[PDB]
Design a protein around this nucleic acid. Structure first.
Lengths: 65, 49, 218, 129, 65, 88
RNA sequence: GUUCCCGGGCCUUGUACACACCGUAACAAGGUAACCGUAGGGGAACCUGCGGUUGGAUCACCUCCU
RNA sequence: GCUUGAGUCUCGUAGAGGGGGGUAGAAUUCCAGGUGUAGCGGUGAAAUGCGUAGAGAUCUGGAGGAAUACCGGUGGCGAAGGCGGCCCCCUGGACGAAGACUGACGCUCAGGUGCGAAAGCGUGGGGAGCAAACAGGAUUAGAUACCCUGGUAGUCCACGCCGUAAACGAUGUCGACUUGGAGGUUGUGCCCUUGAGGCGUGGCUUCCGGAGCUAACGCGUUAAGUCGACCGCCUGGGGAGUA
């Protein structure tokens, strides 16, 4: 129940990370496919893209080292 | 605003929701007497004190 | 006309549709119509409800669930039948031979109260015959003076009282049981499907059974 | 894999009565239809339909009695592996007669009694009770 | 991870730390690996996770107490 | 996953149509085409205890397909082994 | 007032027990859950490491948000 | 000769599936340097060891080594075993909308061939962590046993040999048939995918049940229900799945 997965079609990208802030916490923790009202397919693909965003320095690992 | 004191919140609808059947008529919620009838009749539900 | 169109007793998906065939009907958000098997099955019902009455028959009404529990007491008092508006105790047809031990006990209490010693004992014990006898009202008042077996039992439920249907299959007695579509097609002789938990059907069906007893003896 | 049509058609009959239906449809051959012909004359099948275009759908209407199976205890005797020939005097009778021992004879398809009428035996396909 | 709040505290406030993991990865990287263990205990855990929902289905149909 | 603009060339040769790759003479050739590009893997890497099940699978399928063409149409089989050279 | 302590009852969980609770390794979670496969070792049971499974036990309390 | 069986192509998706190599980052053992203390570690408890030759602790730089928290789902792939970062190349298997065909080309087995976790060992390298044999201190009447500190073998990369299991959802395999619900995972066709969907079809898997089987528990479209085809095994236990 949300007007975003009703207009969300075909693999959400890894470029601008503004909407990736909407799946992660302000710690660097990812939300499971059960809390977020999003089929595993999607919550998981967003996830793999984020690990690549770490190899690109968009998002760091944990907050501080 | 009670179903036990007056009636079904909706047409044949129990307070707790034990009866979400618009076929159920008469049978009350055994916890508190909710005789299921049409909620529209609640424009004529007369009670007392 | 199909009784203000209520005959069809809406069907709840978890109804587990063995009865799927016989019911047919449309499907509304849960499912819903038991159509045909319901409507014309009452015409042949009227037929047998006349014949068993032509052989002097009584209908021990077996009803529970608070909804019809009122017209059961009235439909029984309206003609001549016995009733079970309150809890239908498991054993009132098979273990009934031993319920008779208590039936004689009830007929002896009716003695002590009416023409007995309800004024020749401790007020402490006289009240014991009082409160208990009222427990005999809600339990055995609608079968207080049976002696012989009724010729038909109206089973209000199969989804909840299939045991009431089972014990009938112990005497092989005519069963006029109204059903839901998660029940078994076996055990019942003259099925009257569809809606049963509706105060209107209570008036409709139960009234049409006691009244049909009234003409077999005429 | 559906190598013995006869046997896995009797399953549609067995489970057919257990699942309580009214009509079964299986791949057709006019030899199986001839079996239904013998079964109609006896009262086991009711009105056989040989409807076909290029994919022969033989539709056979299963029969009941009092809401009970007339064909309840039926299975294969002459298996596709163990096809057994019989004479005329060593020939078996289903239910000692209250059932028919369907046998494929030198002419076509008939029963144990009709095989006596021919004076020659063959494949006792199955015990039908 | 990092809690601050300039002035209205009068308390430490480490509630998101526990709301992160805290013992989450403590219990996983403190003792011997033993690769198979979690799998089995999540087994008894999952069957009892469906059991409360079985209790949810056990309270809706009757309970005429 | 296959080399489409090489195998479509094969159905063009063997087939009397472009949609006709149901005939034995065309299908075993598309199967051998798979094996022509399969050599490339069974020459290197050495540890394919998984890819091995593919070898035995497509070879089994192929051995018996040419084993039927042999038992029915020796006209097409001798022309097929002479058209692709799938004998050796 | 039932949270401490002695005895008692009901419900419940568990047992290769019903003849009925030189060293404890299994049977209550036997206070170290069990068995198969492999190498090695010690008076000896068995143990240590690695892989698998359920022919295993309680999910009851004590501190925080509606 | 004809098609409901087997099979392939045109058009596509997903994946701890395998393989060779390379790389990113944290932690740990340890080395150099600045600061600094007398305790660290461990257990029911004590203790071996380290310590003014400055350990543990903190920050910066860094070389071996093995392995991927959170995404993680009685979820996915596969004949099975077994297997969790990313990239490049190679590639097997499973499945689907709409057509084109040879026309049963299908199933399985003694001898036979191949895969084979982990472990044993030979060989060119290796050793951070854990840790068979063993040593010290204790529980103890005793310790070669729960514990801690060290430590050879092993663990890893590549080639092979003996060729083994609870290699077990204990359910052999190809296939057809047999009222539903909560679902999960991956595609697809139709209608306005306005929308988080409605109606059908295949693969894998979990729970409650009817038919039926059964000693019972229960399995229940992935069957222990109903048949056909192919193979192995059993005739009470032990001896022994051993010489």
């Amino acid at each position: 129940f949300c007007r975003f997965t009703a207009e969300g079609v075909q693999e959400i990208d890894y470029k601008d990370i503004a909407t990736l802030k909407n799946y992660i916490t302000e710690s660097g923790k990812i939300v499971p496919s059960r809390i977020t009202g999003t089929r595993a397919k999607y919550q998981r693909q967003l996830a793999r893209a984020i690990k690549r965003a770490r190899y690109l320095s968009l998002l760091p690992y944990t907050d501080r080292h | 605003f009670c179903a036990r004191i007056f009636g079904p919140v909706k047409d044949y609808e129990c307070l707790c929701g034990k009866y979400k059947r618009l076929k159920h008529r008469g049978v009350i919620c055994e916890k508190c007497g909710v005789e299921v009838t049409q909620t529209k009749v609640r424009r004529e539900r007369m009670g007392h004190i | 006309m199909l009784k203000a169109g209520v005959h069809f007793g809406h069907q709840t998906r978890y109804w587990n549709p063995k009865m799927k065939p016989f019911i047919f009907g449309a499907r509304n958000k849960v499912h819903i119509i038991n159509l045909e098997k319901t409507v014309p099955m009452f015409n042949e019902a009227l037929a047998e409800l006349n014949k068993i009455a032509s052989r002097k028959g009584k209908i021990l009404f077996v009803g529970t669930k608070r909804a019809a529990s009122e017209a059961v007491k009235d439909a029984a008092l309206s003609c001549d039948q016995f009733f079970v508006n309150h809890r239908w105790l498991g054993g009132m047809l098979t273990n009934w031979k031993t319920v008779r031990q208590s039936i004689k006990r009830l007929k002896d209490l009716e003695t002590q109260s009416q023409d007995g010693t309800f004024d020749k004992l401790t007020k402490k014990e006289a009240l014991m015959r009082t409160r208990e006898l009222e427990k005999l009202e809600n339990s055995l008042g609608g079968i207080k003076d049976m002696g012989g077996l009724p010729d038909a039992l109206f089973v209000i439920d199969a989804d909840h009282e299939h045991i009431a249907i089972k014990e009938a299959n112990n005497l092989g007695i005519p069963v006029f049981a109204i059903v839901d579509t998660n029940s078994d097609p076996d055990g019942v002789d003259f099925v009257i499907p569809g809606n049963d938990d509706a105060i209107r059907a209570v008036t409709l069906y139960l009234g049409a059974v006691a009244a049909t007893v009234r003409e077999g003896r005429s | 894999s559906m190598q013995d049509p006869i046997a896995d058609m009797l399953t549609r009959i067995r489970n057919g009565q257990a699942a309580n239906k009214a009509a079964v449809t299986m791949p057709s051959s006019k030899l199986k239809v001839a079996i239904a012909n013998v079964l109609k004359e006896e009262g086991f099948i009711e009105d056989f339909k040989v409807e076909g275009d290029t994919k022969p759908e033989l539709e056979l209407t299963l029969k009941y009695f009092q809401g009970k199976a007339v064909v309840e205890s039926i299975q294969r005797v002459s298996r596709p592996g163990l096809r057994i020939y019989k004479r005329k005097d060593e020939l078996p009778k289903v239910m000692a007669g209250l059932g028919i021992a369907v046998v494929s004879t030198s002419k076509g398809v008939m029963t144990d009694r009709a095989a006596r009428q021919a004076g020659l035996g063959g494949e006792i396909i199955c015990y039908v009770a | 991870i990092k809690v601050r709040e300039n002035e209205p505290f009068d308390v430490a406030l480490r509630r998101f730390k526990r709301s992160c993991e805290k013992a989450g990865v403590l219990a996983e990287v403190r003792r011997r690996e033993f690769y198979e263990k979690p799998t089995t205990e999540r087994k008894r855990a999952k069957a009892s996770a469906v059991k409360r929902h079985a209790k949810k289905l056990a309270r809706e149909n009757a309970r005429r107490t | 996953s296959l080399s489409t603009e090489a195998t479509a060339k094969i159905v063009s040769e063997f087939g009397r149509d472009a949609n006709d790759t149901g005939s034995t003479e065309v299908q075993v050739a598309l199967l051998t085409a798979q094996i022509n590009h399969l050599q490339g893997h069974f020459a290197e890497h050495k540890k394919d205890h998984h890819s091995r099940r593919g070898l035995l699978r497509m070879v089994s399928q192929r051995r018996k397909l040419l084993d039927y063409l042999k038992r029915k149409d020796v006209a097409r089989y001798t022309q097929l082994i002479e058209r692709l050279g799938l004998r050796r």
